[PDB]
Design an enzyme around this catalytic site. Structure first.
Site, PDB file in Angstrom:
ATOM      1  N   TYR A  47       0.856  -1.178   0.000  1.00 29.04           N
ATOM      2  CA  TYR A  47       0.000   0.000   0.000  1.00 29.04           C
ATOM      3  C   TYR A  47       0.899   1.237   0.000  1.00 29.04           C
ATOM      4  CZ  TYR A  47       1.250   0.843   4.749  1.00 29.04           C
ATOM      5  OH  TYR A  47       2.153   0.897   5.721  1.00 29.04           O
ATOM      6  N   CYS A  48       0.307   2.379  -0.332  1.00 32.99           N
ATOM      7  CA  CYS A  48       0.968   3.671  -0.283  1.00 32.99           C
ATOM      8  C   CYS A  48      -0.095   4.744  -0.096  1.00 32.99           C
ATOM      9  CB  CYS A  48       1.751   3.880  -1.579  1.00 32.99           C
ATOM     10  SG  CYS A  48       0.670   4.137  -2.988  1.00 32.99           S
ATOM     11  N   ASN A  49       0.293   6.013  -0.099  1.00 39.61           N
ATOM     12  CA  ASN A  49      -0.632   7.088   0.217  1.00 39.61           C
ATOM     13  C   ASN A  49      -1.828   7.148  -0.744  1.00 39.61           C
ATOM     14  OD1 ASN A  49      -1.814   9.124   1.594  1.00 39.61           O
ATOM     15  ND2 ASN A  49      -0.772  10.762   0.667  1.00 39.61           N
TER      16      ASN A  49
END
EC number: 2.8.1.1
Length: 85
Positions: A47-49
């Site tokens: 995941y990331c922002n």
């Protein structure tokens, strides 16, 4: 089992990260996955922002021959506990 990986800059990690993730930015995930998750058959959730860069990391990993990588979404979408840096 699973492992979770933050694949963005540490900047998000400092304010909050999914509890149990490790910061391994997109630029480096290609090499560092081998030390983070030595058995590529193990489940890896990235995941990331914004969900996009974890999408890219998922493609990088798929090229590295992973069997159980998944883009979980963006930091907002993951509904796990979170902690600050």
């Amino acid at each position: 089992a699973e492992h979770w990986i933050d694949v963005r800059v540490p900047e998000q990690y400092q304010q909050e990260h999914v509890q149990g993730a490790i910061n391994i930015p997109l630029k480096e995930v290609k090499e560092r996955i081998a030390t983070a998750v030595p058995d590529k058959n193990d489940t890896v959730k990235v995941y990331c922002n914004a969900g996009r860069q974890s999408g890219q990391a998922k493609e990088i990993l798929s090229e590295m021959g992973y069997t159980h990588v998944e883009n979980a979404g963006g930091l907002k979408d993951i509904a796990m506990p979170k902690v600050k840096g």
